[PDB]
Design a protein around this ligand. Sequence first.
Ligand SMILES: N#Cc1cccc(-c2ccc(C(=O)O)o2)c1
Length: 429
Amino acid sequence: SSSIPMPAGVNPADLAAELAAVVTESVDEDYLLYECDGQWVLAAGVQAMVELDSDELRVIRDGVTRRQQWSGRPGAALGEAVDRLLLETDQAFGWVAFEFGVHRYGLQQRLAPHTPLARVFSPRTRIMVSEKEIRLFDAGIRHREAIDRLLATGVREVPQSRSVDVSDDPSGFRRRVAVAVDEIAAGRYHKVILSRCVEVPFAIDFPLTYRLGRRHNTPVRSFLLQLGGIRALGYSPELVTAVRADGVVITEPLAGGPAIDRLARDDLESNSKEIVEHAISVRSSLEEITDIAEPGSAAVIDFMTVRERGSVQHLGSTIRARLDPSSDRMAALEALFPAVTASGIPKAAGVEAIFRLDECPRGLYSGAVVMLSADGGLDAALTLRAAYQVGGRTWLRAGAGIIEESEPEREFEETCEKLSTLTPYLVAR
Ligand SMILES: N#Cc1cccc(-c2ccc(C(=O)O)o2)c1
């Protein structure tokens, strides 16, 4: 492990995104950049890839693909493969699809064959960028020379963004919300999150868009990736699960000018509908975390407080527990996935309603971006406020929590508001 001092007057997010863009392009390698607690970790190059699909598990290393049949819990299949990765490298990175969370509710038969559940890789090199320093892990000579060449120059100018039209409704979001409202009125479930894709008619420069959007937002976590033909970036508004080496498990569900921002904060703390849903959600997180925790260790340590994320303020709680010796970090992720914010209440009913009333598979949207460590660590950020590119198609995706009182026009405008997090910050390629 070697170190380079962080150059003064340079923002870590900008430098990490520039390294991700230029260093990985010169050697033509895949990567994942993950921001977590002031640290930007760039996982560059694929030493080994774990592909978990609905019908198969693959481990691809040095041109060789090992295929495996799997049965039971997807977390057990993923965990066993990722633990083997972590015996050779200190950290592993990737993404978990929304579809990974359907098995706990017995809904996996509704998945088409070859449905992606997770993609986790061990990188060839890691570059950690923070305000204090740049730390290099397993960086070969060719990579160290590329990093020094990038550092001898200033970061690129971020060009002006290109606007996107989000006013159209080709997937019939308004109609699908009306169906959900009728189902809720009939007592089938209490809440469901429905969403819509918005096609971007031009190719996006992902690392430059990442930089422009990160200037205005201070999210819980962020990511930028180019992995297995998928380009993605996002500003995670929620921590699904964090597992520490000492056994502490955390989950932080959310639920919700200077004078205008203070008035919005006062409403966020007094809104009855938001308070009721938050209490139900906190109770759901507590019941779920108790199935993997040491008896009597589950507790709410921060209850209903505002967290400022720069351009967005959230009402949230922190649920903590100690991981039971009979459980593991993948079981903890399975117990807390999918998030209530990504599914609905009751969670099983919300997930089932999403199969019928949303464009499926969701893939990365409402899934998680993850960082795992050899000492047992896990960090999983909820994937919302994200942009994607897969084989010629570039798109955004945003949803809304639909309840009995929801109105289709109001909820369409609510997805328009969530889309505003990225739409003015899209840099064209
Ligand atoms: N319940 C609930 C809830 C609270 C906050 C956000 C969301 C939600 C659903 C989908 C999205 C999004 O796409 O950003 O955000 C859902």
